mmCIF file of C-alpha atoms in Angstrom:
data_model
loop_
_atom_site.group_PDB
_atom_site.id
_atom_site.type_symbol
_atom_site.label_atom_id
_atom_site.label_comp_id
_atom_site.label_asym_id
_atom_site.label_seq_id
_atom_site.Cartn_x
_atom_site.Cartn_y
_atom_site.Cartn_z
ATOM 1 C CA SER S 1 -11.474 -18.475 3.167
ATOM 2 C CA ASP S 2 -11.524 -16.748 6.593
ATOM 3 C CA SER S 3 -12.727 -13.224 7.170
ATOM 4 C CA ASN S 4 -9.193 -11.894 7.616
ATOM 5 C CA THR S 5 -7.934 -13.405 4.373
ATOM 6 C CA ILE S 6 -10.692 -11.508 2.509
ATOM 7 C CA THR S 7 -10.000 -8.239 4.376
ATOM 8 C CA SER S 8 -6.259 -8.572 3.652
ATOM 9 C CA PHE S 9 -6.994 -9.075 -0.078
ATOM 10 C CA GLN S 10 -9.385 -6.107 -0.221
ATOM 11 C CA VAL S 11 -6.850 -3.799 1.434
ATOM 12 C CA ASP S 12 -4.038 -5.060 -0.805
ATOM 13 C CA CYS S 13 -6.228 -4.400 -3.862
ATOM 14 C CA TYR S 14 -6.964 -0.834 -2.770
ATOM 15 C CA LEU S 15 -3.327 -0.100 -1.961
ATOM 16 C CA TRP S 16 -2.375 -1.485 -5.399
ATOM 17 C CA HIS S 17 -4.854 0.990 -6.924
ATOM 18 C CA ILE S 18 -3.116 3.871 -5.085
ATOM 19 C CA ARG S 19 0.265 2.707 -6.346
ATOM 20 C CA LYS S 20 -1.147 2.493 -9.854
ATOM 21 C CA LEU S 21 -2.348 6.090 -9.645
ATOM 22 C CA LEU S 22 1.188 7.171 -8.626
ATOM 23 C CA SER S 23 2.714 5.279 -11.535
ATOM 24 C CA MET S 24 0.277 6.574 -14.138
ATOM 25 C CA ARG S 25 1.159 10.107 -13.049
ATOM 26 C CA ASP S 26 4.820 9.144 -13.818
ATOM 27 C CA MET S 27 5.811 9.825 -10.228
ATOM 28 C CA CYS S 28 7.471 6.474 -9.404
ATOM 29 C CA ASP S 29 10.812 4.938 -10.339
ATOM 30 C CA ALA S 30 11.436 1.694 -12.220
ATOM 31 C CA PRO S 31 11.618 -0.606 -9.159
ATOM 32 C CA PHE S 32 8.255 0.753 -7.974
ATOM 33 C CA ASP S 33 6.736 -0.109 -11.373
ATOM 34 C CA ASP S 34 8.271 -3.610 -11.291
ATOM 35 C CA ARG S 35 6.665 -4.289 -7.904
ATOM 36 C CA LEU S 36 3.362 -2.945 -9.236
ATOM 37 C CA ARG S 37 3.469 -5.287 -12.208
ATOM 38 C CA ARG S 38 4.427 -8.318 -10.133
ATOM 39 C CA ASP S 39 1.777 -7.617 -7.467
ATOM 40 C CA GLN S 40 -0.864 -7.197 -10.171
ATOM 41 C CA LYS S 41 -0.223 -10.740 -11.333
ATOM 42 C CA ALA S 42 -0.203 -12.017 -7.744
ATOM 43 C CA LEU S 43 -3.460 -10.234 -6.921
ATOM 44 C CA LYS S 44 -5.178 -11.582 -10.048
ATOM 45 C CA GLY S 45 -4.223 -15.108 -8.980
ATOM 46 C CA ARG S 46 -5.243 -14.642 -5.333
ATOM 47 C CA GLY S 47 -8.548 -13.194 -6.524
ATOM 48 C CA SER S 48 -9.120 -16.141 -8.835
ATOM 49 C CA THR S 49 -8.485 -18.668 -6.066
ATOM 50 C CA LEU S 50 -10.724 -16.771 -3.700
ATOM 51 C CA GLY S 51 -13.454 -16.318 -6.355
ATOM 52 C CA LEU S 52 -13.446 -12.546 -5.689
ATOM 53 C CA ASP S 53 -14.287 -9.714 -8.093
ATOM 54 C CA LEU S 54 -11.171 -7.469 -8.095
ATOM 55 C CA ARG S 55 -13.124 -4.339 -8.796
ATOM 56 C CA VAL S 56 -15.465 -4.848 -5.849
ATOM 57 C CA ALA S 57 -12.581 -5.927 -3.588
ATOM 58 C CA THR S 58 -10.784 -2.680 -4.397
ATOM 59 C CA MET S 59 -13.874 -0.672 -3.384
ATOM 60 C CA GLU S 60 -14.161 -2.643 -0.150
ATOM 61 C CA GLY S 61 -10.479 -2.018 0.571
ATOM 62 C CA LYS S 62 -11.087 1.715 0.242
ATOM 63 C CA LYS S 63 -13.861 1.636 2.880
ATOM 64 C CA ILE S 64 -11.690 -0.397 5.265
ATOM 65 C CA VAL S 65 -8.667 1.841 4.888
ATOM 66 C CA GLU S 66 -10.755 4.988 5.362
ATOM 67 C CA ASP S 67 -12.290 3.402 8.407
ATOM 68 C CA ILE S 68 -9.021 2.522 10.130
ATOM 69 C CA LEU S 69 -7.412 5.873 9.215
ATOM 70 C CA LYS S 70 -10.380 7.662 10.832
ATOM 71 C CA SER S 71 -9.889 5.635 14.074
ATOM 72 C CA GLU S 72 -6.308 6.863 14.662
ATOM 73 C CA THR S 73 -7.147 10.606 14.686
ATOM 74 C CA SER E 1 18.878 10.244 -5.402
ATOM 75 C CA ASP E 2 16.299 11.061 -8.106
ATOM 76 C CA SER E 3 12.924 12.739 -7.386
ATOM 77 C CA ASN E 4 10.815 9.735 -8.468
ATOM 78 C CA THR E 5 12.906 7.481 -6.246
ATOM 79 C CA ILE E 6 12.256 9.679 -3.200
ATOM 80 C CA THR E 7 8.567 9.909 -3.992
ATOM 81 C CA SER E 8 8.321 6.121 -4.389
ATOM 82 C CA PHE E 9 9.935 5.613 -0.984
ATOM 83 C CA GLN E 10 7.656 8.148 0.746
ATOM 84 C CA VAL E 11 4.548 6.492 -0.701
ATOM 85 C CA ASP E 12 5.799 3.022 0.224
ATOM 86 C CA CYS E 13 6.387 4.217 3.813
ATOM 87 C CA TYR E 14 2.875 5.587 4.132
ATOM 88 C CA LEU E 15 1.237 2.481 2.620
ATOM 89 C CA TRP E 16 3.247 0.325 5.033
ATOM 90 C CA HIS E 17 1.836 2.470 7.874
ATOM 91 C CA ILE E 18 -1.703 1.728 6.679
ATOM 92 C CA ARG E 19 -0.974 -1.978 6.447
ATOM 93 C CA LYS E 20 0.462 -1.883 9.968
ATOM 94 C CA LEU E 21 -2.774 -0.255 11.236
ATOM 95 C CA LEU E 22 -4.682 -3.231 9.745
ATOM 96 C CA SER E 23 -2.412 -5.717 11.492
ATOM 97 C CA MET E 24 -2.708 -3.889 14.859
ATOM 98 C CA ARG E 25 -6.500 -4.244 14.592
ATOM 99 C CA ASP E 26 -6.309 -8.083 14.263
ATOM 100 C CA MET E 27 -7.803 -7.689 10.770
ATOM 101 C CA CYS E 28 -5.178 -9.382 8.570
ATOM 102 C CA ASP E 29 -4.062 -12.969 7.945
ATOM 103 C CA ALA E 30 -0.678 -14.565 8.523
ATOM 104 C CA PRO E 31 0.793 -14.035 5.024
ATOM 105 C CA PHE E 32 -0.110 -10.334 5.236
ATOM 106 C CA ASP E 33 1.814 -10.066 8.530
ATOM 107 C CA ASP E 34 4.762 -11.912 6.941
ATOM 108 C CA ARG E 35 4.856 -9.330 4.106
ATOM 109 C CA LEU E 36 4.630 -6.518 6.639
ATOM 110 C CA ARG E 37 7.653 -7.825 8.542
ATOM 111 C CA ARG E 38 9.662 -8.350 5.334
ATOM 112 C CA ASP E 39 8.741 -4.892 3.985
ATOM 113 C CA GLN E 40 9.638 -3.174 7.244
ATOM 114 C CA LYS E 41 13.211 -4.409 6.833
ATOM 115 C CA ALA E 42 13.085 -3.380 3.179
ATOM 116 C CA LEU E 43 12.001 0.183 4.055
ATOM 117 C CA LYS E 44 14.724 0.455 6.677
ATOM 118 C CA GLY E 45 17.393 -0.673 4.217
ATOM 119 C CA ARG E 46 16.120 1.488 1.361
ATOM 120 C CA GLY E 47 15.729 4.470 3.662
ATOM 121 C CA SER E 48 19.249 4.088 5.027
ATOM 122 C CA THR E 49 20.783 4.133 1.575
ATOM 123 C CA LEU E 50 18.703 7.161 0.567
ATOM 124 C CA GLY E 51 19.636 8.881 3.862
ATOM 125 C CA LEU E 52 15.971 9.508 4.725
ATOM 126 C CA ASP E 53 14.242 9.780 8.086
ATOM 127 C CA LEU E 54 11.455 7.147 7.924
ATOM 128 C CA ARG E 55 9.039 9.129 10.078
ATOM 129 C CA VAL E 56 9.297 12.273 7.916
ATOM 130 C CA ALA E 57 9.111 10.138 4.767
ATOM 131 C CA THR E 58 5.859 8.559 6.069
ATOM 132 C CA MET E 59 4.353 12.010 6.690
ATOM 133 C CA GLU E 60 5.364 13.168 3.207
ATOM 134 C CA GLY E 61 3.902 10.006 1.696
ATOM 135 C CA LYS E 62 0.602 10.731 3.413
ATOM 136 C CA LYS E 63 0.528 14.132 1.716
ATOM 137 C CA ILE E 64 1.362 12.681 -1.686
ATOM 138 C CA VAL E 65 -1.303 9.994 -1.505
ATOM 139 C CA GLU E 66 -4.019 12.355 -0.235
ATOM 140 C CA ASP E 67 -3.122 14.686 -3.090
ATOM 141 C CA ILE E 68 -3.372 12.119 -5.890
ATOM 142 C CA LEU E 69 -6.581 10.758 -4.307
ATOM 143 C CA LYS E 70 -8.073 14.278 -4.410
ATOM 144 C CA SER E 71 -7.846 14.396 -8.228
ATOM 145 C CA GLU E 72 -9.061 10.845 -8.907
ATOM 146 C CA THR E 73 -12.681 11.249 -10.089
#
């Protein structure tokens, strides 16, 4: 799909990864875990339809987020 | 409320901030902007019932995320 659909998916994948780290550390509440579980299923489906490797998309999302965070300083 | 519930809210605020940076750079697609608008209302309503200042919660979320990212690998 278009460039921005891919970028949006990469960023969403990386932010999911951050949320997962919070949850694994047992630092979130139940609603936060429910959203994590539901978004995981949604991301897997979006990735399938886009043909995208979730692991690589997560790594690309990390670069993009670091990039835009650097630009606001 | 409970500690995990506050922490979840702070993290959600900071991740919304990141997503908003993406949108302000013309880097996201239309569904991503729709989720950003929906989640902004969600953070305002959740924050109001927890009593929390959204700007302070965003700053605290930044600290929490940077901290769990420090000890990743």
